Homo-oligomer: 239 residues x 6
């Protein structure tokens, strides 16, 4: 039951005393941040949201305000992922070196915040994963605390828009990021603009491709103005 | 007249019964009864029962079993053999009744062996329907579902596989498996509300009309997939799921004399 | 032989017959025979015949009648009652043979009563044709479909019925009994669909289920018509109106 | 009776008139009477007249001229100012009548000044003007015109008044006529040959064959911006389509017919 | 500075007023004010007022009445005759002002007759209100949308009208005269389309033309309803039923 | 001026040439020149030539051969090796020049060895070793259709596919393999009902150009086209949002 699960989670959390919470802006890291605040108090919980070139400014700006709106002291930290050569040249193991850079910045922040642990929201300690929470359990408990505001747009690293071996630059990341922002504002929350130098290859859930037709010409000109020469739609669909 | 009066009537009605057995579908109506019963009478006096049968999906049973747990109820699986009744097995027009009689005769049997005063279901506006007695409508159950912080119900109604077969067709493990595999395939493409109606060698797919435009990109995959499941012709009902529910005033009434012609 | 040799052969055989009855479908082959008969024997010695029946559309009949008249032929409609032969009514694989025997026996009566020497059809390079003595002069002169296209260009023929009408029999499974009502039901449904902008269409009969076949490349266009087609075909007697996901054939 | 007799009536009627002026649309019926007039009387006794106006496209005018020139007739272009009749300018329901009267009045003036005995049109207001529709006097039907057009080797022939794009009572101007014409031309160039851009002052109501509306979606934004730069504030698409009512079932065809 | 200080200011403002009339929309802002007013002054000192009028739908009214009752307030409906003011009836660009002016004069009349010290609305930190002297305690306490969210969560408030209503006046061109019949015609048309699955929609009135605004991403989905929509809006009184190629908020 | 005078001009020019070799594509323009050549000079003074090459489809070639024989001409196939010129093989913006040179240099030699006075092609109004009689007579696309209808010509190739070279970027080297890959992809797309199509080659990406008014119809074929062009060797199969050209 959920009452049994939350007792386990608070009990496990009650041991830690001082915590630093890696705050995504999603609901699971939202559950940990506000339940940690509930048991240890505002002054013993630090919410950290990472700002970097590989994720959107919107996801960062929404999560920063979402942590205060939960009542936490919140700290922005900026990671320079592109300064790791594995990330900069988009090797297939590059997810490893990026997560190595991220967890050491938060562990380094936890050392100077006098914290006993770094906490994350996976379904570093994932206490939500330890209490056997499902997406259903996190939904009942987050409403149960009156929580209504999370970033339900799950974002991935922009690295996945680039082929292995391609060098990421500030300019081509921005170009890909601006194209996906425009596509999202037309009503397509799940979208990918895959980068192939002068070709943009747009991935959409197949069930949306019919709805998309009315935007064909506007998307063509918009992504061309962002620097692509050819703007195309993958017939295979999203992933 | 107020939501509070309807809820107070329900708490009062529940308190008198003391020990209850809850027929738990997993939909919004029976979750309200299950979470209300636990709150006013406590975990030791409420048994949630979820039916498992050949006429329903494993996902429906498993999704409902896990909600009796997350709401905190003591929950019991009970399996019904609907296919052993000839009315159901040969899908006569009265089979809904014999299905509900066999269902309700098992929960009472369960109510005897746990000492409950009544079996409760979630029917709205020895089986009691407290929401019906408290004058809850579909709007009231939604409001009270928020007042209790309830977020998890089965959002699309799950219905007996019997409704996919014409009256007189005998249900078999093979043709039920065929219908269920076809709907599961369709749902995995992004169509949570779907029906694959069985007409021997013809499959007649019902989709909400607002989704049919999106479906075109899947025509060929759905055709070949349902053909390998045993249908020879895979077709799309032009009337859609729930024909007439969205029409204009002249033609929803002409489709209803059509649907009533049979 | 050359096309000129083939045309002279065809001119001679007609010039020999002096008076003819032409079975006129409207396709290119029967259009060629009809205009060669007129060119060689003149309007007064040629009678064009178009068969009218329950198994073909009124529309195809009117198009053949009017194409025969605009070619300059005297044209005559004749109505055949195909459902009175049980081989056709019971929709067996040999029903086309009994239909064409019924057709050629009506044409011979028309040639007898107008004094023509032969019935002509448009077959190019079939058992009921011979048993009734009709002649296929394009086939005797060794015309192939390219010879027909070639001679039709040289005579300036540009307008024939391109889409070949097929009998409504193909909308019913083999053995299913054809009745006036189930034929009318399918034909009204296909006529309604064609009037919406879908010239090539099949409404397959499955008793209470209608299964619509459309070219896949047109199904996107069809969406705006779902509700009208559903209710229209229901008022024609179908209980369920469906669209084949496989498409045309 | 027979096509040969119908042609005899028409050849006899033409030989009686001796010299004629022919109203030439460019369509098949006026091409037939123009070509029979040439065969029975020759170029010096036949004047083909092609009407130019604000209510038809310049392209239709130029194509009609070339078909009359291609048939071998002496062709005269006369341009009419239809908007100078107030019935036409303000689009009353009888405006078709005053348009045909002004047309037949210029044709009679042309025929009077070139010595023709009659004005001929291709019909299958005239009788106030004295105009003779010889195909109609010979009882020609659409099949007889097509049978005879082939017998004489006619293969090349070609429209509604722009008045039909405007509501009754709406005043036609040079500018709003041009606006409707350019809008329909732009749409035809996107691949939609059958189209109407109905004028409702600041609203454009586009009629399309319903079977094309799915194909049209990829053009929504371009059509909106193109027709706005042509002077409309709102660019809209009629959900009934082109010719509202003709593709529905017997029940909703008698629902949309009652609604008019 | 912090939400706690912002909440303290609002508690203070309410304790000074002692008795209030709350203009209740059903939205998150007016739900916060209604719940803090009930918490600080008690049920008998708070009147929730829900306005019913021709320019908003019966559902928006019935939902707002019912949302105020589930919060635990005494709520009274008051009906306004907006078409009475000629600025509203002939839909001038100033018509928003005369309607909000007529609304605030009804609220003061209710507050005067129940002994309330102020009429409260739900205005936050980002015209005719201050003329009648209504108070916007959320704006005075420096609440932003994030602060309204934080306090709504901490108070267990989860049930509001997440999408707010606009006056049906926006379906009419400036200068067009609103009547009882063409307002109803617009509202039944929009209700019918929403019942097809198009929750965000506008039927703009152009005498005999209906101009439907839809989010462009839904127009592909809409095609299957064309004839049904066309005939239904014709039975509601429009002669031509059209779809704006520009989309929603054209 | 009129179509009658434009046709008389063409009749006289043909009578002056007396014997001609006609470059026959199978389209409407070269179909008009071919029948008018046959009509004025007869089968024995007219040689129809259909070029067969790697840059045009075998389908267009088979139709042309059989269409000219059906028009009543003696027809000759001649095979060109466009890829043997390095300008064409490496797809420079110049390759049209060397392709048009190789084509007319082959056709003049056919005319030399059968003693005809000119090579005729189908260029209209709106390569100097060739006579474009339709262009000299002031034929427009409208004149060609009017004159083609007047003579009962009905059967030509309605869609002029052009050189497959344009499916490759400037600088890309054409191979037998990548040409066959593009040709097979366009053949498949044409067989689904899209006679006007381009599969632009971008190595591992296929970029399909379709007339925009057809893209709605295409949705039902996405997955089949994706898998079929992948089996032909493309890794990503895409649709240009710009449409055809
Ligand atoms: Ca189409
Ligand atoms: Ca959709």
């Amino acid at each position: 039951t959920l009452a049994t699960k939350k007792a386990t989670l608070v009990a496990a959390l009650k041991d830690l005393q001082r915590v630093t919470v890696a705050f995504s802006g999603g609901i699971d890291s939202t559950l940990v941040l506000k339940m940690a605040l509930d048991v240890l108090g505002r002054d013993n919980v630090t919410a950290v949201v990472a700002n970097s070139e590989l994720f959107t400014d919107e996801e960062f700006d929404k999560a920063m305000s979402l942590a205060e709106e939960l009542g936490a002291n919140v700290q922005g930290t900026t990671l320079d992922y592109l300064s790791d050569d594995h990330i900069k040249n988009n090797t297939p193991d590059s997810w490893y070196y990026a997560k190595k850079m991220f967890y050491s910045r938060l562990n380094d922040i936890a050392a100077n915040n006098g914290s006993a642990a770094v906490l994350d929201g996976m379904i570093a300690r994932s206490l939500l994963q330890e209490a056997d929470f499902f997406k259903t359990d996190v939904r009942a408990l987050a409403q149960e605390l009156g929580l209504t505001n999370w970033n339900k747009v799950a974002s991935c690293s922009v690295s996945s828009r680039f082929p292995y071996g391609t060098t990421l630059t500030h300019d081509n990341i921005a170009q890909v990021m601006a194209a996906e922002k425009y596509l999202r504002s037309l009503g397509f929350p799940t979208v990918r603009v895959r980068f192939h130098n002068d070709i943009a290859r747009i991935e959409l859930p197949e069930a949306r491709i019919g709805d998309f037709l009315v935007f064909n010409d506007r998307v063509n000109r918009q992504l061309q103005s962002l620097g692509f020469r050819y703007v195309t739609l993958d017939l295979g669909g999203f992933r």
